[PDB]
Amino acid sequence: GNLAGIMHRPDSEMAYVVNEQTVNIRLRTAKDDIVSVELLAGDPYSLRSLPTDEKFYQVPKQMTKIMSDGISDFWQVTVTEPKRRLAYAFLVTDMLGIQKIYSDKGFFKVADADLMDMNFYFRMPFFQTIDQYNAPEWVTDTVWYQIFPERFANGDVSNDPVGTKPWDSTDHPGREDFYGGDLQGILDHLDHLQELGISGIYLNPIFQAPSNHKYDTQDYMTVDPHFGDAKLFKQLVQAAHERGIRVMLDAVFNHIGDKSVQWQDVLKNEQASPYADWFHIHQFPATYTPTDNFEFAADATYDTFDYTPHMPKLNTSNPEVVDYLLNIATYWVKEFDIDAWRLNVANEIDHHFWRKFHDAMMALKPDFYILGEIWHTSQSWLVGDEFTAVMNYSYTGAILQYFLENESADALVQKMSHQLMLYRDATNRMMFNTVDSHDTPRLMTLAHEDKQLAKSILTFTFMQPGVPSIYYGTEYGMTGENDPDDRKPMVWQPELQDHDLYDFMQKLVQVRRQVIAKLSDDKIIFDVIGERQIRLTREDNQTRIVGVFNNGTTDLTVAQPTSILLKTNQSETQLAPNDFMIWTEPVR
Amino acid sequence: GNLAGIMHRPDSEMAYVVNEQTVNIRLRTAKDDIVSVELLAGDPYSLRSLPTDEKFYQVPKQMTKIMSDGISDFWQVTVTEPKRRLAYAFLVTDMLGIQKIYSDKGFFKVADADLMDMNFYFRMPFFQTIDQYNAPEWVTDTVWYQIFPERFANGDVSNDPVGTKPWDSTDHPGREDFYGGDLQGILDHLDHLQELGISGIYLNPIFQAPSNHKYDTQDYMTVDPHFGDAKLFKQLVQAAHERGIRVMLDAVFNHIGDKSVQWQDVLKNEQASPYADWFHIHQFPATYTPTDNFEFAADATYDTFDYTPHMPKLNTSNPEVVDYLLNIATYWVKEFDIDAWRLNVANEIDHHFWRKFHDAMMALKPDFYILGEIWHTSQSWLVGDEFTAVMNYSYTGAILQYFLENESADALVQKMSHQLMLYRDATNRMMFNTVDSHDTPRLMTLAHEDKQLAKSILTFTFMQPGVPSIYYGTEYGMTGENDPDDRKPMVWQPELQDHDLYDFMQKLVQVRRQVIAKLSDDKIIFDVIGERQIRLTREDNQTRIVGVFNNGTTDLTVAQPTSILLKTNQSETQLAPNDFMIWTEPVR
Numbered sequence A, B: 001g002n003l004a005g006i007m008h009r010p011d012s013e014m015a016y017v018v019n020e021q022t023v024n025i026r027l028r029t030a031k032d033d034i035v036s037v038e039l040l041a042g043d044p045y046s047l048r049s050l051p052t053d054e055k056f057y058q059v060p061k062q063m064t065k066i067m068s069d070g071i072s073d074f075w076q077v078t079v080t081e082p083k084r085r086l087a088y089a090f091l092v093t094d095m096l097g098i099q100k101i102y103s104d105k106g107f108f109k110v111a112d113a114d115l116m117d118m119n120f121y122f123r124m125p126f127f128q129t130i131d132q133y134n135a136p137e138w139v140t141d142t143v144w145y146q147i148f149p150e151r152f153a154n155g156d157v158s159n160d161p162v163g164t165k166p167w168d169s170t171d172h173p174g175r176e177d178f179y180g181g182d183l184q185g186i187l188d189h190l191d192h193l194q195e196l197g198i199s200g201i202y203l204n205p206i207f208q209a210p211s212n213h214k215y216d217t218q219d220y221m222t223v224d225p226h227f228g229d230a231k232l233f234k235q236l237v238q239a240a241h242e243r244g245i246r247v248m249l250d251a252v253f254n255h256i257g258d259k260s261v262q263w264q265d266v267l268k269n270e271q272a273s274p275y276a277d278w279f280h281i282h283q284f285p286a287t288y289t290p291t292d293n294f295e296f297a298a299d300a301t302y303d304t305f306d307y308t309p310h311m312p313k314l315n316t317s318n319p320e321v322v323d324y325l326l327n328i329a330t331y332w333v334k335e336f337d338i339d340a341w342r343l344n345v346a347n348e349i350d351h352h353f354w355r356k357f358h359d360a361m362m363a364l365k366p367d368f369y370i371l372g373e374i375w376h377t378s379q380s381w382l383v384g385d386e387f388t389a390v391m392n393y394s395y396t397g398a399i400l401q402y403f404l405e406n407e408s409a410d411a412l413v414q415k416m417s418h419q420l421m422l423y424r425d426a427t428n429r430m431m432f433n434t435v436d437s438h439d440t441p442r443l444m445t446l447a448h449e450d451k452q453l454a455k456s457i458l459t460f461t462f463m464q465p466g467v468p469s470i471y472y473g474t475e476y477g478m479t480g481e482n483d484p485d486d487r488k489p490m491v492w493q494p495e496l497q498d499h500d501l502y503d504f505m506q507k508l509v510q511v512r513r514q515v516i517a518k519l520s521d522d523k524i525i526f527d528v529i530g531e532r533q534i535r536l537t538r539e540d541n542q543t544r545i546v547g548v549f550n551n552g553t554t555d556l557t558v559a560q561p562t563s564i565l566l567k568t569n570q571s572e573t574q575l576a577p578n579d580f581m582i583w584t585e586p587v588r
């Protein structure tokens, strides 16, 4: 067998606590090299301490091959142990029938293994629920809607910035434009959100800042006055909550804006500033050489987000900064009852801070949702002591690549499988899936205005384990290239809205919330049934939901389903190129 | 190539911060399958943000194959980056010359890789020294001596337990025997320790407890009165410190003894006890059925260490228990200036507690040494936020197995290589290497009283990266089977001491402290030079120390070294079976 392809990392996503007496264990092997895996497991102390002749290694537990990423196969088993201590090893058999035991001590013939020595085995030493990953259940039933507040709705012309342009969803906005969107506009259109069926709003930053996007924070403790005030934000959160809609705000803690009191004090007082060590300043005075691009300097004497001199990086290892940021994070939860924080550039802040943040939030709200913005693999933030989830850009990016280009269905299924096996099962269900955002081109533009393709992408994404999000205006087919063009004023004129797409998105949201969210502990299965043809199944003990996606260039015929939930062709059996069909069937 | 055998786990022992601008990166591949590995790495934002034509991926960095465990090869490189943000990927070429790029997105031909997208790469997002592993430098120069205080020296008959037996190192002690050893006895023999050359004392538990081993704690805040009192312990620590000897105490925090105030309160008051939730009680009253073995019950209604009813497990997730234990840990450091804590059964206490413990200790003493007793792989406790090191029983156990049985030298070198590549390089230098202890048979008994074999085992262990420890009496050749027989009264009668072994151990301690500890940033190399013949090299930029060990059944001839440090044969060129020779040479 391919022994170099076999690996088990103890105390990780491959061995973790699910409840006081139960653990999940995984093994990686080389694809199709290993025929079978059994787990030998039990209480380490039982081997020598108990007077019985029975030994735990005499009754193996079968492991199941659950996924493959094209390189490796992944196997899993759930183990229950009342003594809440576990020693375990793997019996692996390859395609030629060669069997070995694999343990913390390496690879052995069974006859050579020291099975009576507890230290031979991998260990889960005591099942610690304080250390385990917990998923908040309310997120399961959520469909999110992301609002970039400058561009959603102007409900109050009297707070508009100087130079505000007329509201025109056909504009191509520049980087410094204002259209006057604000919190009253969101309040004004809560009926639209409830009619669409969404149950969570994600706001981009709303705190005082000079820009239209407000990531260059001036004051974290004040709603930007062009958006509203504290009273209005409280009214908005209560009105959302009354409609069953949770609220997630954007925490911009990696850097502060250069018009903040703190940075302005550094510019006035240099190293004598009380805030000098709140930042990462290499040489005083803190300076840079301006260029023709506001957002770029080649030589700032302080660390920044990217290379923009207007966003000095915060020193989150400084205990005064930790206290400042934790007080901000507490204030908005305690005084306004928000339900979640989305963490901007969360990977560039240290784990020590995020553990303190996690502890503070869970002490306020044990079901709080902490969402990190990270575009690469995120295992070390998703153990259960830092974030709940991340924005799942690697996963939706792979979906986009499949639908928009011409890779094989095998390639896509390999990539999604790889992703899921990076994380604990409950973590995968908390991941935040959005196909586009204020940082990407719009879906309808990526699809070259092919609405059928856009519907397929959205439906495929809405069938995945993670929770889906709709970027404002997707439901009417808004177009746009990348930032700033993906931030057009929301389309409120009916002549300019795609009503068919809105109707479709209402139906899709209903399949997600009424069917997919209501299965119990389901299994997801990816089947490649032909060239660019995929069958996705989610199933529990009672019911199976199946979606077939034909993204080749030929017609596909399927058996007429008894209960079709959603389809694009008028036929109940034939799928043309880029059609899909979702149905439900009982499990037999 | 064997792609299933290639793996890089970001933010782990394969990618970690060594200082503000420097990181160490590792890759695993299948043994001898990959010919070369280059790293492509640089600031993620530099790709699109900088106006230059240069891109970081145009100048690869060569990685070096540093170890092999017989299954996998391990490659390493050190990278410096002034922007303190790193994106990286690996260029791997197999034995047939097939080259691929391996990144967070998987495996690609170079021509197909999206090298301009920062999200293609693995990431070290910002170099966080607050999250990094730190090794205390004083441990580098230490050789430890482990004292089981009941059995080292009786310096005060007036505190002896009732039934104390006459001091006789030829006795076979029973599990409940007392010989009257105490803290005054240790004070009385500090000259012996200084003459041997040791610079750290590890004491087994000294707090009030009814047994001879005192792991069944009655009161953590009081020195056991058969050992001494607070004044005497302060005198002992100051006297040790005056001689350049650090002091490590045993923290028994996984369980408490059943004669403690807390457990006795549970027995009196059942669930109405203020301490009921300090424990893991499944059913009240807390009870068990006694057996003929004091240390075993089959049905205790509360969790215990092993199956002994006298050691109820502490609930370290309870904040009252956390506070109690942290106060104890603080008290002995603050009031008595101890230098380290050894943590008994440390794996069965939760990571949340150990992070709080770590933070508390480092705030008192930034160079504190935290040593966990764990007999299996310990990666998740050695990241830099919990322990400094563990008792390195997997490593010394492999050494013992080689010298005492007849496996190949390749097998041993594979096992040691596997061990070292589990951990960060600095961690490996902090590991605590003892060949025997109060929990194992004695070295001289394992060696069947073959003193030459015992000398080889000790010398081989003392050349390893971790810090060595001598269990009391090893230096005079004490014998003993496992506990309780490994706890004989210390041999103080000269007629019964092996003076040749004591002389040898003085010389060996001097090679460790004067030569091996004084190299700068050295490399360790394991060479198998013949059947059961091993050449161990440690070398820095100026000097190389080489040890050759002949453990076959034939003579071995080596070149006459110019500067021999330590050898067992009278010859300067010939090694008989089980001889060794250590020398030093300049690096050319």
Ligand SMILES: [Ca+2]
Pocket (backbone or CB within 6 Å): A154, A155, A156, A157, A158, A159, A160, A180, A181, A182, A226
């Ligand atoms: Ca307005």
Ligand SMILES: [Ca+2]
Pocket (backbone or CB within 6 Å): B154, B155, B156, B157, B158, B159, B160, B180, B181, B182, B226
């Ligand atoms: Ca005494």
